[PDB]
């Protein structure tokens, strides 16, 4: 019975043909990931070394992952050592032990977020309209014990409580932390997470267009030079009278 509502289009600063990502809004978006989610969501494909030269200095990046100690394998005179994280470690998984992570969430596995804007019909415009589109039910819709109303979700019944409201965090450069400033930064981060070659492919696309602009009008001149013999010729028919 109930039906679709599609996200509108926002003017992100990377929606141009040659427009880059803002590398300061990526930096503020990693901190909203590491302190608001990552208590519900995995990021299985991104490591700490993937953030050196995008948003953090190698040192500033090795200062993080000190913050979490992680299990490693068996060693002699030991069985389950623990140790601080290195640079080659992936981001820690939220709900330890798997799947049956549905109990903390009323039987709704929370999805992995490393491909989430690339795997949705609408990209980061969908993950902006859903985090800021939480509202109250209309006149007489059904609701279970632990589910909420959200018009930008297929069956309008989401099993995630609204995770950002206002002043949920403190940014470390003095940016105000309202509801719309956050969720603008975990849309910029999480677009970099899907597509980490975004800025490199747009600058190879400019060094291809400028060089084709030399090579292509000048193979066309070689073509017109040969074919002018045939394009200008004349014919006469002179049969005997």
């Amino acid at each position: 019975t109930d039906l679709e509502l599609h996200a509108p289009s926002y003017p992100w600063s990377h929606r141009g043909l040659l427009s880059s990502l803002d590398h300061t809004s990526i930096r503020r978006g990693f901190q909203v990931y590491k302190q608001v989610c990552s208590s519900c969501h995995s990021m299985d494909y991104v490591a700490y070394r993937h953030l050196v030269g995008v948003c953090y200095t190698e040192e500033e990046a090795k200062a993080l992952a000190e913050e979490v100690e992680v299990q490693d394998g068996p060693n002699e005179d030991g069985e389950m050592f623990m140790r601080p994280g290195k640079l080659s470690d992936y981001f820690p998984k939220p709900y330890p032990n798997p799947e049956a992570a549905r109990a903390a969430n009323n039987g709704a596995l929370p999805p992995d977020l490393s491909y989430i804007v690339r795997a949705r019909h609408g990209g980061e415009d969908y993950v902006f309209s859903l985090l800021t589109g939480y509202c109250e039910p209309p006149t007489g819709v059904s609701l279970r014990e632990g589910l909420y109303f959200n018009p930008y979700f297929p069956g309008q019944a989401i099993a995630m409580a609204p995770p950002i409201y206002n002043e949920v965090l403190e940014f470390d450069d003095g940016t105000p932390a309202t509801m719309s400033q956050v969720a603008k930064d975990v849309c910029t981060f999480l677009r970099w997470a899907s597509e980490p070659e975004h800025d490199h492919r747009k600058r190879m696309g400019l060094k291809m267009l400028m060089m084709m602009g030399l090579l292509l009008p000048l193979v066309y001149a070689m073509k017109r030079h040969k074919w002018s013999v045939l394009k200008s010729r004349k014919l006469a028919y002179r049969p005997p009278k």
Binding site: H50, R118, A119, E197, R201, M208, L230
Partner: protein, 378 residues
């Protein structure tokens, strides 16, 4: 002496590409044969790079494809060259077939019948490769074909539990999908050499339909420079897609790993299989569905004996040209319907356009050519 005419290897190159007599009025619709040969070489070299880092196992198939796009150096450009180069192959192939149909090139009988074989072998190759990344369209694309492939009356269920390794989907399942997909592009190459060997016996057709031995020109330099220029203009368009929109032609739902337990909101194949899918879903049967899918490629082989006109090409036939673009505008309708869900407006439009695809080729075209013969008094 002339070493181009007396050396044993250089003789073959000279007779095939340098001193070959060619018509002088060949259009740029005749460019797409060498474009197909460029697209085939590109898919082979790029595919041989991806095969050193891919793993055919249903627990690590999706994860070995994300690894090359993130870890291996230049793996992201080579992967999206391969996915977008396959759309480039299928758009040149549909231009190529529509050319030979409008200008009457099917009268070269041995060249046309090797071509219908080549059309089956590239469609089966591209199906196997889209199973290999093993996301939620590689899954629900594989099962829709192979429960439709259990409706073969006497050997059907024998053939469905052979391709999965014996089973349902496991580690040894995509070793057979991968080995077919490796081998078939190298048979396509051998069939395209035989294809050109039979065309060398007559030379080319031309847009008028009339024979042109009195007006030949050498192939070099006139069509060596015209084919290089068209190939550069094709490498430009392909890189506009790889570097400015690499996900425009795909579907987002294939970035979720395959899960028999979860659910995909729709089932949509690639754009170049969407016309065949619309003919399937218009037949309420599963033996009459796989028959009408195979009869829509095999109807091309009846074009030589359905020809009733006195002239070879459609340049001077104005009523046959209205029917030619009614047929192109009917394959556009079947591509749109194949990507829609199965409800009321898109169910009658889909079956009234499956009837029109067979009514134009088999009935309306041979009758219209006879009316044209009679208005010219033969």
């Amino acid at each position: 002496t002339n070493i181009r005419k007396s050396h044993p290897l250089m003789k073959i190159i000279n007779n095939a590409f340098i001193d070959l007599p060619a018509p002088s009025n060949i259009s740029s619709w005749w460019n797409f044969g060498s474009l197909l040969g460029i697209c085939l070489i590109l898919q082979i070299l790029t595919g041989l790079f991806l095969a050193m880092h891919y793993t055919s196992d249903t627990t690590t198939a999706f994860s070995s494809v994300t690894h090359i796009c993130r870890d291996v150096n230049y793996g992201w450009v080579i992967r999206y060259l391969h996915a977008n180069g396959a759309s480039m192959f299928f758009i040149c192939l549909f231009i190529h077939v529509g050319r030979g149909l409008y200008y009457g090139s099917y009268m070269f009988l041995e060249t046309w019948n090797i071509g219908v074989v080549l059309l089956f072998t590239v469609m089966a190759t591209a199906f196997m490769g889209y199973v290999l990344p093993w996301g939620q369209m590689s899954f629900w694309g594989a099962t829709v074909i192979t429960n439709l492939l259990s409706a073969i009356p006497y050997i059907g269920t024998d053939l469905v539990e052979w391709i999965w390794g014996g089973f349902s989907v496991d580690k040894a399942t995509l070793t057979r999908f991968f080995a077919f997909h490796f081998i078939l592009p190298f048979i396509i190459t051998a069939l395209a050499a035989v294809h050109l060997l039979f065309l060398h016996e007559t030379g080319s057709n031309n847009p008028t339909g009339i024979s042109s031995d009195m007006d030949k020109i050498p192939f070099h330099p006139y069509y060596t420079i015209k084919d290089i220029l068209g190939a550069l203009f094709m490498m430009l368009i392909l890189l506009i897609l790889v570097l400015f929109s690499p996900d425009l032609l795909g579907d987002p739902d294939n970035y979720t790993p395959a899960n028999p337990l979860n659910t995909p909101p729709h089932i949509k194949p690639e754009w170049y299989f969407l016309f065949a899918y619309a003919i399937l879903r218009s037949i309420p049967n599963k033996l009459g569905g796989v028959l009408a899918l195979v009869a829509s490629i095999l109807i091309l082989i009846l074009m030589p004996m359905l020809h009733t006109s006195k002239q070879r090409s459609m340049m001077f036939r104005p009523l046959s040209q209205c029917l030619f673009w009614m047929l192109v505008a009917d394959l556009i309708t079947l591509t749109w319907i194949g990507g829609q869900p199965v409800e009321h407006p898109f169910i009658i439009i889909g079956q009234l356009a499956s009837i029109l695809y067979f009514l134009i080729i088999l009935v309306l075209m041979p009758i219209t050519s006879i009316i044209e013969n009679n208005l010219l008094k033969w």
